[PDB]
Amino acid sequence: PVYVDFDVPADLEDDALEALEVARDTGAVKKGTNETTKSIERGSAELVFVAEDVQPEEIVMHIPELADEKGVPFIFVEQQDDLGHAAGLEVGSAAAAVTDAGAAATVLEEIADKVEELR
RNA sequence: GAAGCCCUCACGGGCAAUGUGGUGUCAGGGCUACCUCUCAUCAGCCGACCGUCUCGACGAAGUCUCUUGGAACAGAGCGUG
Numbered sequence: 723p724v725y726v727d728f729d730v731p732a733d734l735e736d737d738a739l740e741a742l743e744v745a746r747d748t749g750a751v752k753k754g755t756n757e758t759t760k761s762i763e764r765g766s767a768e769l770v771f772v773a774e775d776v777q778p779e780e781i782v783m784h785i786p787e788l789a790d791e792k793g794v795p796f797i798f799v800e801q802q803d804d805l806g807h808a809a810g811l812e813v814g815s816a817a818a819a820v821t822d823a824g825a826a827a828t829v830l831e832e833i834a835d836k837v838e839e840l841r
Numbered sequence: 842g843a844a845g846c847c848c849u850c851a852c853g854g855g856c857a858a859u860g861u862g863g864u865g866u867c868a869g870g871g872c873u874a875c876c877u878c879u880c881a882u883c884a885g886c887c888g889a890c891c892g893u894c895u896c897g898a899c900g901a902a903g904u905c906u907c908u909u910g911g912a913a914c915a916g917a918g919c920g921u922g
């Protein structure tokens with residue numbers, strides 16, 4: 723909400739999650755806000771996901787601007803439990819980072835484009 | 842970075858990426874490359890002596906003489922641990 727400056731259409735979010743699932747199987751992904759933050763800082767992040775139902779918002783507030791000054795692309799997901807399930811967790815996840823996609827580097831790279839265009 | 846914890850005989854359930862657990866805590870630590878090494882620390886097992894306080898068992902040698910007296914545990918005499 724305060725850290726969300728653009729709305730991601732339902733369909734875009736699905737493509738994103740889908741890509742994330744093939745990422746945990748084919749490539750590499752980081753689950754959890756602390757491990758995600760470190761990707762963006764270490765530059766190893768290619769696409770970071772951030773839930774929008776995070777309370778307190780403090781936990782994720784920094785992702786956006788941090789991602790911006792690091793060139794890393796990011797996309798918002800409405801449900802926290804969807805991101806966690808997509809990432810492969812039995813629990814939810816406030817943030818995730820596809821650390822080097824897998825059999826999705828295409829669809830992925832394009833999701834990053836659609837979002838950059840989503841302003 | 843799920844390698845973790847709780848409940849339950851089990852099955853099974855719950856917690857946990859908003860981080861369970863590993864590492865680590867100024868002899869600073871982590872990371873990288875090395876040297877040596879552990880006897881520090883932490884976790885868990887076993888598990889007292891002595892002392893002190895109280896309680897309890899066992900525990901030596903006269904119940905002799907005369908006098909006074911209601912009564913000798915008194916006086917005089919003899920004897921014991």
Ligand SMILES: [Mg+2]
Pocket residue numbers: none
């Ligand atoms: Mg510890």
